[PDB]
C-alpha cells in the first residue's frame, strides 16, 4: 500500500470515523481504523460490531493498491499535530506503516486486514432520499422522549415508519409520547422499524446543515445512510413497538389555547418555586382563567394567575414540571393548543397552526 494526501482533506474524515471508536474495545482490532487504497480512492472504515462508518477520499497523485489497519487515536493525533498545508505520504513495509510529512517521520504498528470484521451484505427493501432539514426536524422533534435506560428494549430506540408518502418518527418512555410526521414527496410501502439510541446520535452528527440530500436504505434488520461521501450502517433492534394511535385520546371534550411564552414563564417560576424533588405542580383551569400552585412537599406556595382562552368546565389536575416544560420547549412557537378529557386522562399538546408534531403526557396522580 502507498498513497499521499493533504492534511485538510484527511482531517475531517478521521474525526467522523473516530467518533464511535473509543474506550477499551472488546477486541483490539476493533480499536483500529481500516484503510484500503484501490480504484484511485482511499476508504477509511471504523466499526464496533453494531455501527459502521465508512469515508472515501479521492487521490490525485500516484499510489498503489493495498489494505491494512492502523490505531485510531495515534493516527488522528499525528495528523492533527502537523502544520497546516502539510502533505502526508503513507506507505506500508513489513509489519509497519511509515507516515512522512516534510522532515517528520513516524512508524506505526499494524495488524493484518484479513481479520477485520465486516458486516454481512444484505438486500435493501425500502430506498428513498430526503433533505437534511427534514430529518433534522424529525429527530429533534422526537428525540428527548426516548427512554434513557429501561429493561424494555423497544423503549430505548426510536420508531421510524413509512406510510404512503409520509415519514413518521415516534418516541416514548412510558410516561411521555412524541409523534412527528412529514411528507417525503414519493409513495413508499408501509413499513416500521426501530433504531437504537446510538444510531440516532450518529445520524444527528452525520448531518451538517448542507444542501446535499441523504439516501436512506432499510432492509430486514439493518439501516444504511449515504450523506455525500459518508456511509453509515447500523443494526435494528428487534421487538414490537407499542402502537401510538390508540393511546391518543379518543375525543378530548376540553380545549385550551395558551400563549407559549406565558406558559414557559409560569412553568419556570413554578420550577424555581418547586426546585424540591417529588410531586409536581397543580393547575386549575376555569373559564378564561388559569391558576398554578406548586405542590412541592411543604414549601410556601405563591399562586400564579393568568388569563387564557378556555370554554369548558373548570377542572384541576397535577402534572410533572419537567415533562410539561420539555414538551413546551420542543414546540418553539408563540401559542399552543392543549386537548384533554378529564383529570385522570392523557393530555395532548400541539402547535396552534402545525399539527405535524404532537405530544401526549399522562398526568401524575395528586
Amino acid at each position: 500500500m502507498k498513497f499521499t494526501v493533504e492534511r485538510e482533506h484527511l482531517l475531517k474524515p478521521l474525526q467522523q470515523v473516530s467518533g464511535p471508536l473509543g474506550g477499551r474495545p472488546t477486541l483490539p482490532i476493533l480499536g483500529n481504523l481500516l484503510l484500503q487504497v484501490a480504484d484511485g480512492t482511499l476508504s477509511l472504515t471504523g466499526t464496533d460490531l453494531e455501527m459502521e462508518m465508512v469515508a472515501r477520499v479521492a487521490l490525485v497523485q500516484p499510489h498503489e493498491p493495498g489494505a491494512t489497519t492502523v490505531p485510531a487515536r495515534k493516527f488522528f493525533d499525528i495528523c492533527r499535530g502537523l502544520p497546516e498545508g502539510a502533505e502526508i505520504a503513507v506507505q506500508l513495509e513489513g509489519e509497519r506503516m511509515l507516515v512522512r510529512s516534510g522532515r517528520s517521520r513516524f512508524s506505526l504498528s499494524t495488524l493484518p486486514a484479513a481479520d477485520f470484521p465486516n458486516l454481512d451484505d444484505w438486500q435493501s427493501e425500502v430506498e428513498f432520499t430526503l433533505p437534511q432539514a427534514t430529518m433534522k426536524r424529525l429527530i429533534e422533534a422526537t428525540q428527548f422522549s426516548m427512554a434513557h435506560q429501561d429493561v424494555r428494549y423497544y423503549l430505548n430506540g426510536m420508531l421510524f415508519e413509512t406510510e404512503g408518502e409520509e415519514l413518521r418518527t415516534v418516541a416514548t418512555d412510558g410516561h411521555r409520547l412524541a409523534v412527528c410526521s412529514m411528507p417525503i414527496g414519493q409513495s413508499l410501502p408501509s413499513h416500521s422499524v426501530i433504531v437504537p439510541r446510538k444510531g440516532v446520535i450518529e445520524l444527528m452528527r452525520m448531518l451538517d446543515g448542507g444542501d446535499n440530500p441523504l439516501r436512506v436504505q432499510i432492509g430486514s434488520n439493518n439501516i444504511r445512510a449515504h450523506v455525500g461521501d459518508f456511509i453509515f450502517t447500523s443494526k435494528l433492534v428487534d421487538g414490537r413497538f407499542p402502537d401510538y394511535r390508540r393511546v391518543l385520546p379518543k375525543n378530548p371534550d376540553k380545549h385550551l389555547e395558551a400563549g407559549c411564552d406565558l406558559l414557559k414563564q409560569a412553568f419556570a417560576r413554578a420550577a424555581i418555586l418547586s426546585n424540591e424533588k417529588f410531586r409536581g405542580v397543580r393547575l386549575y383551569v376555569s373559564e378564561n382563567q388559569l391558576k398554578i400552585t406548586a405542590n412541592n412537599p411543604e414549601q410556601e406556595e405563591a399562586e400564579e394567575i393568568l388569563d387564557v382562552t378556555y370554554s369548558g368546565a373548570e377542572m384541576e389536575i397535577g402534572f410533572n414540571v419537567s415533562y410539561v416544560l420539555d414538551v413546551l420547549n420542543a414546540l418553539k412557537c408563540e401559542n399552543v393548543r392543549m386537548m384533554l378529557t378529564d383529570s385522570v386522562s392523557s393530555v395532548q399538546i400541539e402547535d396552534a397552526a402545525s399539527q405535524s408534531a404532537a405530544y401526549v403526557v399522562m398526568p401524575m396522580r395528586l
Binding site: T172, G174, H175, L177, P242, R246, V247, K277, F278, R279, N320, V344, S346, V360, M362, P363, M364, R365
Partner: protein, 343 residues
C-alpha cells in the same frame, strides 16, 4: 397481618390479592418460588410492570415515589419489588418505608423480600401500618428432622419414585441447601426418563454441598455424634468461617454445662433449668450431655479451649482447626492421650 407458609400460599392467591406482600425468611429457594408464584398470579390478574429495587444507602427514594404516583400511558397496576438488606431496615430506612406506605396506592402491588426482622426491627410504624392489610409468608429452612418429608413431597410432586436410601443420601449430602437439592432432583429426573430412582442412580450423580452453622456443630457435640460433628467441622472450615465465632458459641454452652455439673450434686435438674431459663426443646438433650460427661471431663475441655484461644489470639497460629477437631473428639466420649491437652 395474615401469616402463612409457602405450602399454602397458592390458595390465598386464588382467593385474591392484597395491598402488599411480605416474604421474610432465610432459604432462597422458598422465597424465589413464592415471589414467582405471586408475580405469575399478578400478571394473570392484569399487572404488567415489574419494577424492582435493591435497598441500599445509594438508592434514590424520589424515583420510587414518582413511580408510585405517576401513571403509564398504555399500562396500569404496576408492581413494585424491594430487596431489603440482610441486616434489616434502620431508623432512616424505617422512615423511608413509612413515607412509602403513606404513598401506597391500591393499584400498586408491593412485595418485600429479605431476612426476618428482629424484635426491635419488626416493631415499626410502617410495619404496623402494613399489618392491617398485609399477608406475610414465613420461609424458614426445614431442620434435619423435617427434611425427609419435604424431600419426599417434592419428589412426589415431580412424579418420581424415590427410595428410602436415596432420600437419606440426598438429605445427608445437601443438608441446609434446598436450592442445590432441587437442582439435583431436576438433574436426576432429566437423566432418567423413566423416573425410577434407585440408590446407585442417585449415588452416581451426587456431591457434597451441605451448609451448616456453628449452632449445628454445638448441638452435634452435645448429642455426641462424632462423625456428624467432624463432617460439620470440615464443611465449616471449607466454607471459610472465622474460628472465633465457633469458640464463642461453644464457650457459653461449655460454661453452662460446667456450672450445672457443679451444682447438680444437690439440686434437681428441672429446678436448675428453670433458674437458668433453659429452653424446653433443648432440656432433654442438655440433660443427656450432663449425664454422659464426668466431672474430670469438662475441665480438660476448658483447658484445651483456653489454650486454643491463647494460641489464636497471641501467636496467630494456623493450627486452630486441628485443636478444634481434637476438642470435638474430646467432647464425645473418647480417651484422648492427654498429651495434646498439655495439662
Amino acid at each position: 397481618m395474615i401469616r402463612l407458609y409457602p405450602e399454602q400460599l397458592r390458595a390465598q392467591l386464588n382467593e385474591g390479592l392484597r395491598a402488599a406482600y411480605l416474604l421474610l425468611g432465610n432459604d432462597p429457594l422458598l422465597l424465589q418460588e413464592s415471589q414467582d408464584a405471586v408475580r405469575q398470579v399478578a400478571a394473570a390478574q392484569g399487572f404488567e410492570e415489574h419494577h424492582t429495587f435493591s435497598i441500599d444507602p445509594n438508592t434514590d427514594w424520589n424515583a420510587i415515589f414518582s413511580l408510585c404516583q405517576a401513571m403509564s400511558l398504555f399500562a396500569s397496576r404496576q408492581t413494585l419489588l424491594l430487596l431489603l438488606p440482610e441486616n434489616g431496615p434502620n431508623a432512616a430506612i424505617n422512615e423511608q418505608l413509612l413515607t412509602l406506605t403513606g404513598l401506597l396506592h391500591d393499584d400498586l402491588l408491593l412485595i418485600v423480600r429479605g431476612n426476618k426482622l428482629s424484635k426491635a426491627q419488626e416493631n415499626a410504624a410502617w410495619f404496623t401500618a402494613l399489618a392491617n392489610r398485609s399477608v406475610q409468608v414465613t420461609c424458614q429452612t426445614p431442620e434435619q428432622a423435617q427434611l425427609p418429608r419435604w424431600v419426599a413431597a417434592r419428589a412426589k410432586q415431580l412424579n418420581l419414585e424415590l427410595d428410602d436410601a436415596a432420600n437419606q443420601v440426598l438429605c445427608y449430602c445437601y443438608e441446609g441447601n434446598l436450592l442445590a437439592l432441587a437442582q439435583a432432583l431436576e438433574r436426576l429426573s432429566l437423566l432418567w426418563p423413566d423416573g425410577k430412582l434407585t440408590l446407585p442412580r442417585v449415588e452416581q450423580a451426587v456431591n457434597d454441598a451441605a451448609h451448616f452453622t456453628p449452632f449445628h456443630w454445638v448441638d452435634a457435640l452435645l448429642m455426641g455424634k462424632s462423625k456428624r460433628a467432624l463432617h460439620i467441622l470440615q464443611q465449616l472450615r471449607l466454607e471459610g468461617s472465622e474460628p472465633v465465632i465457633l469458640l464463642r458459641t461453644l464457650q457459653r454452652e461449655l460454661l453452662l454445662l460446667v456450672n450445672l455439673k457443679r451444682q447438680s450434686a444437690h439440686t434437681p435438674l428441672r429446678a436448675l433449668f428453670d433458674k437458668h431459663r433453659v429452653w424446653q426443646n433443648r432440656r432433654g438433650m442438655m440433660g443427656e450431655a450432663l449425664n454422659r460427661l464426668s466431672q474430670t471431663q469438662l475441665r480438660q475441655a476448658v483447658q484445651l479451649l483456653t489454650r486454643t484461644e491463647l494460641t489464636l489470639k497471641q501467636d496467630y497460629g494456623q493450627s486452630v482447626w486441628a485443636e478444634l477437631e481434637g476438642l470435638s473428639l474430646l467432647l464425645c466420649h473418647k480417651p484422648l492421650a492427654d498429651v495434646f491437652i498439655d495439662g
